[PDB]
Ligand binder design. Structure first.
Ligand SMILES: CC(=O)SCCNC(=O)CCNC(=O)[C@H](O)C(C)(C)COP(=O)(O)OP(=O)(O)OC[C@H]1O[C@@H](n2cnc3c(N)ncnc32)[C@H](O)[C@@H]1OP(=O)(O)O
Ligand SMILES: CC(=O)SCCNC(=O)CCNC(=O)[C@H](O)C(C)(C)COP(=O)(O)OP(=O)(O)OC[C@H]1O[C@@H](n2cnc3c(N)ncnc32)[C@H](O)[C@@H]1OP(=O)(O)O
Ligand SMILES: Nc1cccc(-c2nnc[nH]2)c1Cl
Lengths: 165, 165
């Protein structure tokens, strides 16, 4: 219930060292449902209404795949979740059975934006990806937040194409 | 060993109906190592040297995750693999615990290109994604093959950003 999703050993010590006083970054755990986690994702897009049972079910699905789904949180001095980020590690046959890190669902509470918390989330996710043996990390962004990813040391590599249902 | 990776029920019947005479599309199976599968991926990028033991190991990893990794093949009239495509289904908390389909590692043998086999692979992967409940399918492409994805009914949705190790 407070068991971290993945090893705290995968949290970048350099990131931990430069966070603001009393803020932390750490793996998700199941009790994060009760520390404002889904409210943070509302800055991204529609989350929907998810009750605790549905959370517990998806959480255990993700925990059964914790060599694939690396979800971490930023907490303020009061233990409130104020930022989220995901790394999803894709297995391939190409690149000698290579692994690609996919950065997803990056979100910082509006009142907490513009203090480098997104940068720290990206640095932490890039640390995980390198540690577990990804050959690269990629993500999709908008023209409007490309400048954020540039300041995180990402470069334009191609186009995102979509098909909706 | 000839057990399909996923249910043949997930292969689009409309696609099967319009393939060229004696060509088929079907799930990967483990014995596809011996029908030229990795040679097809060489059109994409470097595959490396993978022996049968390493193949069997990754195959079983993927088969243990066949609600996530949907790999399918196009076979010619002689049972040779001439095309490949992947759908990887990502689980999210957003969009009411939504699922996004990721189209990956699309490859047609050079001598078999320009006969709609890539189109059929994309149509088949989009069929899988809709069937299992994805809210969208996305992929990354180059400026040079954007025109292919446009003819498959995809639209530009954002930018692919990359960070290498
Ligand atoms: C892959 C994905 O998840 S894309 C989805 C990204 N998420 C969103 O767009 C949701 C809403 N926005 C947010 O949640 C946040 O604003 C984020 C995640 C985009 C950025 O996090 P923040 O903590 O606000 O940014 P942070 O302070 O770390 O930014 C790092 C630097 O980039 C700058 N920056 C932040 N956003 C942008 C932007 N949209 N365009 C240009 N520069 C930006 C910051 O000013 C800062 O600059 P500095 O180094 O000159 O001070
Ligand atoms: C997400 C990813 O995997 S991106 C990686 C894609 N893979 C590669 O680029 C590897 C090398 N190329 C190939 O393997 C193949 O050429 C593919 C997969 C790109 C396309 O498959 P093909 O079977 O050659 O194409 P197919 O005949 O189905 O093409 C459908 C239509 O798009 C056209 N087309 C194909 N490639 C392109 C292109 N690069 N630019 C513009 N139009 C194209 C075809 O002429 C055809 O047009 P029509 O409907 O007017 O006849
Ligand atoms: N492209 C992409 C983006 C986000 C997650 C994934 C994924 N990889 N494994 C499961 N999902 C993939 Cl393939």
């Amino acid at each position: 219930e407070n068991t971290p999703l993945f090893s705290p050993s995968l949290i970048s010590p350099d990131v931990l060292a430069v966070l603001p006083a009393d803020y932390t970054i750490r793996p998700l755990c199941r009790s994060d449902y009760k520390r404002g986690y889904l409210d943070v994702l509302r800055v991204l897009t529609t989350v929907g209404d998810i009750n605790e049972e549905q959370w517990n079910s998806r959480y255990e699905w993700i925990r059964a795949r914790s060599d694939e789904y690396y979800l971490l949180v930023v907490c303020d001095g009061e233990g409130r979740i104020v930022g989220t980020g995901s790394l999803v590690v894709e297995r391939k046959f190409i690149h000698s059975l290579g692994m690609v890190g996919h950065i997803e669902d990056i979100a910082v509470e509006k009142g907490q934006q513009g203090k480098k918390l997104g940068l720290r989330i990206i640095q932490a996710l890039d640390y995980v990806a390198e540690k577990v043996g990804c050959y690269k990390t990629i993500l999709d962004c908008s023209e409007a937040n490309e400048g954020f990813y540039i300041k995180c040391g990402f470069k334009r590599a191609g186009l995102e194409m979509a098909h909706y249902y």
